[PDB]
Amino acid sequence: KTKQGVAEAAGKTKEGVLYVGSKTKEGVVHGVATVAEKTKEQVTNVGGAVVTGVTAVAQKTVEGAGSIAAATGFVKKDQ
Amino acid sequence: KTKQGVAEAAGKTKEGVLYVGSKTKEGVVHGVATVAEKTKEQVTNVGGAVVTGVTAVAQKTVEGAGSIAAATGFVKKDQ
Amino acid sequence: KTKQGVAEAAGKTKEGVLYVGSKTKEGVVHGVATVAEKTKEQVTNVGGAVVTGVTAVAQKTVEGAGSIAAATGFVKKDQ
Amino acid sequence: KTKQGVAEAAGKTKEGVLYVGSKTKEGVVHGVATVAEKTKEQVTNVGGAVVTGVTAVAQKTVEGAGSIAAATGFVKKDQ
Amino acid sequence: KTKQGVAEAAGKTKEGVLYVGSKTKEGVVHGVATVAEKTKEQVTNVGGAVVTGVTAVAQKTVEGAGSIAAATGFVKKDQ
Amino acid sequence: GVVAAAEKTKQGVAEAAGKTKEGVLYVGSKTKEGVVHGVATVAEKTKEQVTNVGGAVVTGVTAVAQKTVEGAGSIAAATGF
Amino acid sequence: GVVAAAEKTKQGVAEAAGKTKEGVLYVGSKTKEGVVHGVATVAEKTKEQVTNVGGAVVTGVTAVAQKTVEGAGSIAAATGF
Amino acid sequence: GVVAAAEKTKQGVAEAAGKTKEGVLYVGSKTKEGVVHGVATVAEKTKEQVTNVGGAVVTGVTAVAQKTVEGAGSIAAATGF
Amino acid sequence: GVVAAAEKTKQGVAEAAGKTKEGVLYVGSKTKEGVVHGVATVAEKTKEQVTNVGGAVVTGVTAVAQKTVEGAGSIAAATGF
Amino acid sequence: GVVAAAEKTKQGVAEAAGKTKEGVLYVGSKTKEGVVHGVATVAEKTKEQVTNVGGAVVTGVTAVAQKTVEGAGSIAAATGF
Structure with a gap:
């Protein structure tokens, strides 16, 4: 297997109040x-x-090479 | 296996209040x-x-080589 | 196996209040x-x-070589 | 196995208040x-x-060689 | 095995207040x-x-050779 | 007297304010x-x-x-006259 | 007297303010x-x-x-006249 | 008297303020x-x-x-007249 | 009298302020x-x-x-007149 | 009298301030x-x-x-008139 960027929460009780949360x-x-x-x-x-x-x-990019997130305020004059 | 960037929380009780949280x-x-x-x-x-x-x-990029997050305020005049 | 950048929290009780959190x-x-x-x-x-x-x-990049996070304020005039 | 950059917290009680946290x-x-x-x-x-x-x-880069985090304020005129 | 940069905290009690934290x-x-x-x-x-x-x-880089964190304010005119 | 003047420009802004009381502003706050x-x-x-x-x-x-603004805030309040 | 003047420009801004009281501002705060x-x-x-x-x-x-602003804040308040 | 002047520029800003009282500002604070x-x-x-x-x-x-601003803050307050 | 002047530039800023009282500012603080x-x-x-x-x-x-600002802060306050 | 002047430059800034009272500022503090x-x-x-x-x-x-600012801070305060 493989896990990457996983939030796992497990809770078990018998009586009362139980809160289980993943983010x-x-x-x-x-x-x-x-x-x-x-x-x-x-x-x-x-x-x-x-x-x-x-x-x-x-x-957020999966399986993407050469990705540019932000290119702000530039002059590109390639040849 | 393999784990990378994993938040794992496990809680077990019998009575009362239980809070389980992953982020x-x-x-x-x-x-x-x-x-x-x-x-x-x-x-x-x-x-x-x-x-x-x-x-x-x-x-956030998975499987991406040569990624540029921010290129701000530049002059590119390659040949 | 392998673990890299893992937050693991485990809590067990019988009575009362239990708080379990991973970040x-x-x-x-x-x-x-x-x-x-x-x-x-x-x-x-x-x-x-x-x-x-x-x-x-x-x-945050997984499996990415040659990644540049921020390239700010430059002049690139390669040949 | 192998562990790198792991925060592990384990707590066990019978009665009262229990706080378990990893960061x-x-x-x-x-x-x-x-x-x-x-x-x-x-x-x-x-x-x-x-x-x-x-x-x-x-x-944060995993499996990335030659990564530059910040290249700020430069002149690159290679040949 | 191998451990590198690990924070491990373990606490056990029977009654009262218990705080367990890793960072x-x-x-x-x-x-x-x-x-x-x-x-x-x-x-x-x-x-x-x-x-x-x-x-x-x-x-933070894992498995990355030749990584430059910050290259600030330079002139590179290699040949 | 408060005077502002902009003569002979291409783009010109002239602002004049006698008194000013700024207010409160929460931006992206909690x-x-x-x-x-x-x-x-x-x-x-x-x-x-x-x-x-x-x-x-x-x-x-x-x-x-x-959250009481202009009065008493109590849990149990037994007042007698 | 408060005077501001901008003559013979391309872009010109002229601001003049007699009095000014700035306010409070929370930006990205908690x-x-x-x-x-x-x-x-x-x-x-x-x-x-x-x-x-x-x-x-x-x-x-x-x-x-x-959170009481302009009054008494109590848990138990027994006042008698 | 408070005077500011900008003559014969390309870009010119002229600001003049008689009195100024700055305020409070929390930026990214807690x-x-x-x-x-x-x-x-x-x-x-x-x-x-x-x-x-x-x-x-x-x-x-x-x-x-x-959090009491302009009054008494108590847990138990027994006042008698 | 307070005067500022900028003549014959390309970019020119002229600021003049009679009185100034700066305020408080928390930046990235706790x-x-x-x-x-x-x-x-x-x-x-x-x-x-x-x-x-x-x-x-x-x-x-x-x-x-x-957190009491302009009043008494107590846990138990028994005042009598 | 307070005067500042910048003549015949490319970039020129002219600042003049009669009085100035700086304030408090916490930057990255606790x-x-x-x-x-x-x-x-x-x-x-x-x-x-x-x-x-x-x-x-x-x-x-x-x-x-x-945290009491302009009043008495007590745990037990028994005042009598």
Whole structure:
């Protein structure tokens, strides 16, 4: 066999209260908080990339080679 | 066998209260807090990359070689 | 067998209160806090990369060689 | 067998309160706090890389050779 | 067998309160605090790398040779 | 007097504010005021006897979460005039 | 007098503020005020007897979480006039 | 008098503020005020007898978390006039 | 008088502030005010007998966490006028 | 008078501030005010008997964490007028 990223919970009782819980998080972005207050912002762009925002990216890939999760704000001019 | 990144919890009782819990986090971005207050910001860009924002990237990959999670703010001019 | 990054908890009682809990964190970015107050910022860019923001990257990879988690703010001009 | 990075907790009682807990952290960035107050910042860039921000990168890799977690602010001009 | 980086806790009682806890930290960056107050900063860059920010990198690798955790602020011009 | 002016630009913003009182803002936050979380009582044998005259009595297994803003917060409150 | 001016630019911002009182802001935060978390009591044998006259009595297994803002916060409050 | 001016630029910002009172800000923080966390009591045998006259009595297993802002915070408060 | 000026630049910022009072800011911090964490009492045998007249009595196993801001904070408070 | 000027640059910043009072800031810090952590009492045999008249009595196993800001902080407070 093989186990990878497994949450296993087992509970046994005879009388009373029993709570059994499993949780798994794989490739999760949780809780991104951002505040801009009274911000002055001035941009001049000529053929380039300017990124000033909020980007929250989550990616879970099985059997994937060469995966790019986030490519933000770039200039690609390959030949 | 093989176990990798496993949360195993086992509980047994006869009377009373029983709590059993498993949790797993794999490739998780949690709690990114950012404040910009009264920030003055001036950018001139000519063919380049300027990144001043918030980027939160989480990636979980199985069986993936050459994976790039985040490529932020770059100039790629390969030949 | 083989165990790698395993959280195992086992509890047994007869009467009363029993709490059993397992937790695992693998490739986790947690709690990134950033404040910019009254910051003046001036950038001139010509064909280069300027990164002044917040980047929080988490990557968990199984069976992946040559993985790059974060490549931030660079100039790549290979031949 | 083999154990690597394992948290094992075992508890046994007959009466009363029993708490059993396991925790594992592998490749975790936790608690990055940054404040810039009244900072003046001026940059001129021509074909280079300037990085002045916050970068928090966590990487957990199994079976991965040649892995780079963070490559921040560089110029690569190989031939 | 073999044990590497294992936290094992075992507790046994008959009556009363019992607490059993295991914790493991492997490749963890925890608690990076940085303050810049009233800092004046001026940079001119021509084809080089200037890094003045906060970089917090954590890497846990199993079965990985030649791994680089952080490569920050460099010029690579190999042939 | 508070004046702001922007003359002869391409893009121009002019903001002027006499007084300003900012408020409260919770962004991505979590508050817990008066919360009871995860209480577990196990009592194999319980006998309660109460003889009350004009008063306030609370017995047994009590899990009370209160959030009182502009008044008294009590469990048992026996006031007499 | 408070003046701001931006003349002859491409992009120009002019901000002027007489008075300013900033407020409170919680960003990605967590507050806990008056919280009871994870209480476990095990009592195999319990007998409670209460003889009350004009008063306030609280017995047993109590898990109380209170958040009182502008008043008294009590468990048992016996006030008499 | 407070003056700011930016003449003849490409990008120009002009900020002027007479008075300024900054506020409080929690960013990615955690507060705990009046919190009871993880209490475990084991009592195989318990007998409580209360004879109260005009007063305040609290007995047993008490887990109390209080957050009082502008008033008295008590467990048992017996005030008489 | 407070003056700031930026003439003949490419990028120019002009900030002028008469008075300034900065505030408090918690960034990535943790506060604990009035917290009871991890109390474990084991009592095989417990008998409580209370005879109260006009007073305040607290007995038993008490885990109290209080955060009082602008008032008295007590466990047992017996005030008389 | 407070003046700042930047003439004939490529990048120019001009900051001028009359008065300035900086505040408090906790960055990545941890505070503990009035905290009870890890108390363990084992009492095989306990008998409590209380006879109170107009006073304040606290007995038993007490774990109290208090944070009082602008008032008295007590366990037992018996004030009389």
